[PDB]
Amino acid sequence: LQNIIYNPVIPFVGTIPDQLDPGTLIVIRGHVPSDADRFQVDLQNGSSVKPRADVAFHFNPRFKRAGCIVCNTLINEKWGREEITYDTPFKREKSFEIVIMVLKDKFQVAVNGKHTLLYGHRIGPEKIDTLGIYGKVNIHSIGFSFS
Numbered sequence: 027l028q029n030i031i032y033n034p035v036i037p038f039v040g041t042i043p044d045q046l047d048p049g050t051l052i053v054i055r056g057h058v059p060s061d062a063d064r065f066q067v068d069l070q071n072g073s074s075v076k077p078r079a080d081v082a083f084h085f086n087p088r089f090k091r092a093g094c095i096v097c098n099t100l101i102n103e104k105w106g107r108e109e110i111t112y113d114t115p116f117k118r119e120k121s122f123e124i125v126i127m128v129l130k131d132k133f134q135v136a137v138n139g140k141h142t143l144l145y146g147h148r149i150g151p152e153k154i155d156t157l158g159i160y161g162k163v164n165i166h167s168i169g170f171s172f173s
């Protein structure tokens with residue numbers, strides 16, 4: 027892996043040091059605290075807060091009740107149509123590895139070595155230059171594999 031970041035402070039907002047071309051991997055290892063309600067990994071067009079940076083891919087594990095993962099896109103401060111995955115591999119008090127693979131028409135995400143979901147591009151992946159991680163999560167490392 028390339029351009030590795032260790033033990034970042036959350037919230038983390040960092041520049042992605044190269045293009046997200048097809049085959050590019052974003053690898054995030056961490057653990058979920060016992061009191062987690064939710065956390066999110068956001069692939070963003072910049073880091074503006076006013077107006078809020080568009081979020082090409084919002085990947086949002088939620089932990090209340092049975093749990094789920096919500097995915098969405100934010101364009102001009104409006105959320106689009108949510109895509110919900112009910113078969114969530116995340117658990118409070120457990121470590122994880124998220125691998126996001128960028129493909130031509132979509133993202134593919136695997137967690138703990140098992141395929142989890144797909145998310146079709148709504149914003150051109152060329153516009154993504156920023157990785158945001160927010161919420162109740164502890165991140166051990168972030169790494170990239172650029173194609």
Ligand SMILES: OC[C@H]1O[C@@H](O[C@H]2[C@H](O)[C@@H](O)[C@@H](O)O[C@@H]2CO)[C@H](O)[C@@H](O)[C@H]1O
Binds near residue numbers: 086096097098105108
């Ligand atoms: O879609 C991603 C965003 O969801 C927002 O919450 C939604 C909620 O998921 C939905 O069920 C409904 O109640 O509308 C809410 C407001 O749009 C979160 O606030 C936001 O952080 C994103 O996760």
